[PDB]
Design a protein around this ligand. Sequence first.
Ligand SMILES: [Ca+2]
Ligand SMILES: [Ca+2]
Lengths: 153, 158, 156
Amino acid sequence: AMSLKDKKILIVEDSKFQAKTIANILNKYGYTVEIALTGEAAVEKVSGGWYPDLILMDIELGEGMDGVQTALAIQQISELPVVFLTAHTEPAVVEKIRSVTAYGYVMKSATEQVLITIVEMALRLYEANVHSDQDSRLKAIERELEVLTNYVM
Amino acid sequence: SAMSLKDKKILIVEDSKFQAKTIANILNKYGYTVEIALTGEAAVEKVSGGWYPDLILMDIELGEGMDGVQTALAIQQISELPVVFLTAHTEPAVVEKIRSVTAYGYVMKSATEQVLITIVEMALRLYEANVHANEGSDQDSRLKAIERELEVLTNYVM
Amino acid sequence: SLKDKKILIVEDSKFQAKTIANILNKYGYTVEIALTGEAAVEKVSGGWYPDLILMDIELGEGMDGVQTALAIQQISELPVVFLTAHTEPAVVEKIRSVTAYGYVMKSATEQVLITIVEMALRLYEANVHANEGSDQDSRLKAIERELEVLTNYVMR
Ligand SMILES: [Ca+2]
Ligand SMILES: [Ca+2]
């Protein structure tokens, strides 16, 4: 239900309170979580060999890199799903998000259920994209079952 | 074949009787079972009474009572039913509220039949994916068991 | 990887169409270009169905991308992903009204475009199989249900 997921999540949120709260919600549904208060922080953490399974990442990070610049810097050294966190959905922000990631965004106001559900869909989408025989196998099963079923008429 | 009996129930939550029936008729044509609630309050009462649709199509604006966002919150405490919002337009203020109460998106009031049915179908399989995943019930883990029993079953011939 | 999936690109600019076509070729998709919506409609009518259409919201002096998408919908269930420069509300509403498969920013990174193409391609295949019954989730429950009655009979 909210069992222990092996997935590691990196939160990139300058706001200490918003960072810690999101970490809390995820922690409580089973995710291993780390925080970075800046996009630069987050790049060092990923280039220092710690590879998350997902990045929740604010489009506003403050006076350094923003979320889009960090998403690209992260892209240079990794092929990790990035899901953006945003306060609002202005066209200028949505364009920026849809142009660096294929994995969408979550409102920082979202209910808890929404956040956790977007994170699972994102992790499952990414696994799907790293990959036929599924059809063949089923076909074998499908007639081997007919093989057997007819015997015990 | 896309019109076949879907074997799925849809709850339209929509105060305009004319709009609700127009959507019910498209959903029936493609083989869905349909229920209409003219208010959010009627919708909450349907589910907390024990009736569970497979998906909700929720207008974000519902007249004098709860609006669609409120309604969606109220149902989120009773079940995790997938809720797809109906909306006239895509102003950031509206899209902001929709995306904070549902992970299943929205459909334009002006969408075509095919866009409606495909969004509904897609939302239904998304939810089935998440429920299956909440339960360890991944399609490949079923494959291991089904093949393993077919071995066992096979050996049973002397 | 080398996919056996063919993508039709409907784009009035030859440079942009060829830019998109190069990227897709570099990842194993068979690609074909229509410079007008009138030509895309004739390919699908003349019986060349692609696996996905990448169509610019805005084309030439003929049909725009939305009208082209609506025509294709009269004769086919093909997945259509719009190319757009700007997600302004009026534009995003037109897009959301004629396709269930979303859009891509002209300025998207190459990884984003590619990923979106794979997702819309997978999604479309699921809907086709589900609507004709041939999806993997269903066929499992068909084997599981008959394998349950088979072994429940052996269990006696
Ligand atoms: Ca911030
Ligand atoms: Ca209304």
